[PDB]
Amino acid sequence: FSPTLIADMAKIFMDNYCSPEKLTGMEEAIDAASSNTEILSISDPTMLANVLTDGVKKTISDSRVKVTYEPDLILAAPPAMPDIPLEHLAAMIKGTVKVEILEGNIGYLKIQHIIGEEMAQKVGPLLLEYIWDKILPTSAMILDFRSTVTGELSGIPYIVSYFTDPEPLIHIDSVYDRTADLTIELWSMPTLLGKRYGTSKPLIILTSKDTLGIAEDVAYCLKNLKRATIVGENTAGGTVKMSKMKVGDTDFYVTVPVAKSINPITGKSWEINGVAPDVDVAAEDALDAAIAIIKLRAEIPALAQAAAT
Numbered sequence: 001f002s003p004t005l006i007a008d009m010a011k012i013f014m015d016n017y018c019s020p021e022k023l024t025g026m027e028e029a030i031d032a033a034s035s036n037t038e039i040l041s042i043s044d045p046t047m048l049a050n051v052l053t054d055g056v057k058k059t060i061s062d063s064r065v066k067v068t069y070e071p072d073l074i075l076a077a078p079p080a081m082p083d084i085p086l087e088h089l090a091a092m093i094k095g096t097v098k099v100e101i102l103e104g105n106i107g108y109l110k111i112q113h114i115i116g117e118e119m120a121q122k123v124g125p126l127l128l129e130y131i132w133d134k135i136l137p138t139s140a141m142i143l144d145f146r147s148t149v150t151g152e153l154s155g156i157p158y159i160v161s162y163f164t165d166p167e168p169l170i171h172i173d174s175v176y177d178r179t180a181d182l183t184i185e186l187w188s189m190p191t192l193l194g195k196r197y198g199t200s201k202p203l204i205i206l207t208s209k210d211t212l213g214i215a216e217d218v219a220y221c222l223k224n225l226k227r228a229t230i231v232g233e234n235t236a237g238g239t240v241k242m243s244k245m246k247v248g249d250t251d252f253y254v255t256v257p258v259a260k261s262i263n264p265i266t267g268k269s270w271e272i273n274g275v276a277p278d279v280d281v282a283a284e285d286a287l288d289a290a291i292a293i294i295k296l297r298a299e300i301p302a303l304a305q306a307a308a309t
């Protein structure tokens with residue numbers, strides 16, 4: 001063990017935590033913890049991990065930060081792979097989406113995985129006809145994120161851009177990564193492969209309590225941009241990036257949020273609390289409600305013109 005252990009955990013935490021400005025008093029609690037003889041009296045490594053974990057809680061107020069003792073932890077490395085041609089990547093993407101026109105000429109696109117910039121640029125031309133051209137002529141659009149739990153940050157501009165004006169460029173999100181000490185800015189793209197959907201047609205996004213990750217960010221941003229109505233349940237409240245980090249040559253690990261979104265409109269984030277629906281309904285009922293909203297609103301102009309004269 002040693003007191004060295006505490007010092008080395010602390011450095012990993014301090015060097016990587018996404019919000020260093022909130023760490024007043026931390027260096028001091030580290031010093032105290034290193035000389036706390038009750039801590040020094042712990043021989044059980046799992047008890048040591050639990051104690052340090054609760055100690056940081058009563059110091060930092062962030063429930064995502066944890067120390068664990070994990071002997072026998074092996075992380076599954078990415079699998080070995082031959083060349084995968086673009087046509088087979090396109091077939092894999094087809095398997096993660098459901099594209100449909102629902103009665104009423106309403107576009108439906110269920111997206112299980114938000115694809116990243118590389119994939120979108122390289123395989124997108126192979127999917128234009130299959131996904132996008134099918135739903136382009138619809139009068140309204142429903143994006144179904146109710147079961148979306150994975151995705152890439154770099155895909156966000158590709159979704160938002162199709163639903164917004166080319167000009168002015170929109171600053172969609174700003175993400176800070178503490179480990180890289182870098183801010184990543186996400187902007188709309190004035191030129192796209194496909195045609196824009198326009199700004200007039202209704203866009204509704206369906207959400208569930210399971211909706212997690214980049215999908216929460218897409219919905220949050222389109223909501224704050226006043227482009228989309230959110231229908232369903234409050235989303236899960238994920239984190240842009242967690243890292244689980246080994247402490248030296250020891251079996252202790254520090255788990256820390258290392259990146260965060262700082263929304264250009266709200267100043268806040270989708271993270272932790274998730275995104276609140278505009279129309280709150282059970283997730284199983286979200287699709288029916290979205291359809292009903294779109295249908296009613298489309299009826300309004302004709303109603304008005306009959307009443308006016």
Ligand SMILES: CCCCCCCC/C=C\CCCCCCCC(=O)O
Nearest residue numbers: 009010013029030033038052055056
């Ligand atoms: C993520 C690793 C950071 C290192 C942790 C430093 C934070 C301070 C740790 C513990 C505070 C001490 C509180 C518990 C005292 C033990 C007394 C008791 O359990 O009865």
